[PDB]
Amino acid sequence: LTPTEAAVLRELRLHRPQLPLDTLLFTDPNKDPDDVVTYTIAKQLQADGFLRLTDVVVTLGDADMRSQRAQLAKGVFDRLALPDVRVARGQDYPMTSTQAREHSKFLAEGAALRAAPDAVHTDGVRAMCERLATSPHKLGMVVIAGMTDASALLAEAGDLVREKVASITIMGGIDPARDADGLVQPDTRAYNNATDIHAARALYRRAQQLGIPLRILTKEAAYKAAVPPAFYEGIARNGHPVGEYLRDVQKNALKGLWEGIQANLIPGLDTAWFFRTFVAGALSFDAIWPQVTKLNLYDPLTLLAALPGTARLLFQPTPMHREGASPVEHVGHAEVVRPEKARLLLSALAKAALV
Ligand SMILES: [Ca+2]
C-alpha cells in the first residue's frame, strides 16, 4: 500500500459493524472489468468484517453462457481465497435474436480463469431462499447486473424478503417519471435495467410494495470517482492472476475501442468522443494509454453504497420516495460527497485483497 492508501483504510476500520453483513450478489461478469473488481474489493471488505459473501447468482446470456460466467466468477473467488462462496447460474429470461448476440459477450481473458462446471450450481436462487429462511440476521442484496434473478427471489420468497432483507442496493437507473402510484421505476436506458426490463420493473415495484429499502446508484455517481490506468497497473504489478486479468481486460477493451474507432470499424464513435470519455488522433494505442485519466467503476461503488460503514464515509443518498412510503434513495453525481476518498478506498481495498 501507499501512505494515503492506509489512512483511508485505517479510517474505514473505525466503522466496522458488530457483525459482518451476509451478502447476496447478483452479477454478470466477464463482459467488462466491473464485476470482478467488485469481487476483489469484497474480498478485503470480508477480511475486515464488513460483509460475508455467501451466495452469488449469475445472469446475462443463455443457460450455457450464464454457466460460463458462473465458472469464471467461481475461478476468481477461488483465486481470491474466497472458497466458501456458493455460485449458481440464474434462470432464463426473454431474449430477442439481437439480445442473444449482445448478451453473449464473453472476454477471452476470462476463459482460462473458468472453474470446472461442477464447481458451480444450476438452480439459481434456491440456496439464497434457503439462506433467507435460516439466517439469524438480515442480509443485504446487491444487484450489479440484470434483475431476472433478484426479481425471482422477491417473487418466490417475498414473505422471507420482507423480514430478512435489510436493503436492496442496485447499479441501475431511475425514470424521472414515477409510476401511477408515485413509485420509483427503472430507466429503460440503464444497462442493468435493459437486460431484462420487465424483471427490473418488477424488482423496483415489489421492493417498494414489500417495504424493503431500495438504494439506486446511477452511472453519474462513478464519474467523479473514476480511476486512472494506475489502479489497474498497480493491482497487476505483483503478478496476482486476478489483478492481471483485470488490467488486461480493461486495457485490451480500451485498445480494441481506440483501434476500431480509428479504422472506422466502429464508425458511430470518433476520436473526440474517446477523448471526452477517457482523457479530459492518428496515434497508436501505447501513445493513448498514458493519456487516459478516467475509468469508471460502477459496480464497486455500488457495493460501497450497500454497506452502511462505507456508505457513511462516501455518500449522502437523496430520498426519492413519497412521504411515509417505502424508502428509495438515489446516489448520483451530487450524492458522492468524498469522491477522492472513494477513489483512494477503491484502490486500497483492491491492492490489499490481492496480497
Ligand atoms: Ca455488472
Side-chain angles (χ1 to χ4, degrees):
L1 282 299
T2 79
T4 72
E5 284 176 345
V8 63
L9 209 35
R10 197 175 311 118
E11 178 181 4
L12 178 68
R13 298 187 163 129
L14 302 179
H15 309 305
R16 186 178 303 108
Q18 283 290 102
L19 291 187
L21 173 71
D22 284 356
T23 303
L24 304 180
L25 186 62
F26 302 82
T27 179
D28 57 345
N30 205 45
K31 50 86 180 174
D32 58 34
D34 232 17
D35 298 73
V36 172
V37 180
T38 312
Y39 308 162
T40 301
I41 68 162
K43 165 56 176 187
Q44 186 62 38
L45 291 166
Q46 179 153 325
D48 280 310
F50 285 78
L51 63 72
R52 180 175 67 171
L53 181 62
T54 63
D55 297 270
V56 170
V57 172
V58 167
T59 189
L60 192 68
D62 62 26
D64 189 38
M65 175 54 68
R66 294 190 304 275
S67 284
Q68 308 309 310
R69 289 191 208 285
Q71 286 163 237
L72 181 277
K74 189 52 173 180
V76 166
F77 295 129
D78 285 349
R79 299 165 168 79
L80 288 170
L82 289 170
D84 298 345
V85 183
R86 187 185 181 284
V87 185
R89 77 156 171 238
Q91 74 180 52
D92 291 338
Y93 62 91
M95 285 200 285
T96 55
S97 62
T98 296
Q99 287 170 314
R101 263 193 308 118
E102 296 172 25
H103 296 192
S104 68
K105 177 176 173 180
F106 188 87
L107 303 175
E109 290 89 339
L113 294 195
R114 281 183 296 192
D118 57 47
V120 305
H121 297 263
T122 65
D123 56 358
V125 305
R126 178 172 177 167
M128 285 185 172
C129 282
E130 295 184 356
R131 178 164 301 276
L132 288 179
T134 58
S135 290
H137 304 292
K138 293 186 177 210
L139 293 91
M141 286 176 53
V142 177
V143 177
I144 52 168
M147 283 149 249
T148 301
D149 305 302
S151 173
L153 180 59
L154 263 71
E156 285 186 15
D159 54 320
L160 301 180
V161 179
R162 184 149 157 77
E163 320 238 19
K164 291 300 195 53
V165 171
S167 64
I168 297 169
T169 312
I170 300 181
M171 199 288 117
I174 295 174
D175 188 336
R178 303 299 179 253
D179 67 9
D181 319 333
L183 298 198
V184 177
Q185 65 183 344
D187 197 332
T188 51
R189 309 163 287 180
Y191 188 95
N192 290 334
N193 293 343
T195 303
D196 183 351
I197 189 57
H198 288 113
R201 284 180 171 123
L203 179 60
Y204 287 45
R205 177 167 288 106
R206 196 71 186 153
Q208 287 163 90
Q209 299 181 330
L210 294 182
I212 313 286
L214 264 189
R215 186 171 288 175
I216 319 297
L217 186 141
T218 59
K219 63 176 138 63
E220 304 83 11
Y223 296 169
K224 292 162 100 164
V227 302
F231 174 88
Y232 286 95
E233 298 293 359
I235 57 188
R237 190 176 295 137
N238 289 335
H240 199 290
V242 177
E244 292 187 351
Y245 161 86
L246 282 171
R247 196 275 315 288
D248 288 6
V249 160
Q250 179 59 84
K251 192 167 172 187
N252 291 345
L254 216 59
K255 177 181 162 76
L257 182 59
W258 174 258
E259 296 176 357
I261 290 170
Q262 190 167 54
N264 292 43
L265 305 162
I266 305 167
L269 299 175
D270 63 350
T271 303
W273 175 85
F274 185 100
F275 267 69
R276 305 189 322 262
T277 299
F278 299 114
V279 180
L283 294 183
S284 83
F285 186 69
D286 39 279
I288 300 291
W289 188 233
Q291 309 189 43
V292 174
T293 63
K294 305 180 278 174
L295 295 167
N296 293 320
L297 292 183
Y298 315 91
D299 293 351
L301 283 167
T302 302
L303 177 53
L304 294 185
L307 313 174
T310 51
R312 278 174 223 180
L313 207 58
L314 303 181
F315 314 109
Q316 290 189 40
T318 300
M320 315 274 278
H321 55 291
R322 199 167 140 111
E323 280 283 336
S326 186
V328 182
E329 288 179 313
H330 175 214
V331 181
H333 88 271
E335 289 78 21
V336 184
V337 293
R338 308 284 161 238
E340 300 183 346
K341 194 178 276 173
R343 205 178 298 115
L344 211 56
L345 185 61
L346 286 172
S347 180
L349 293 167
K351 270 174 190 188
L354 307 180
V355 158

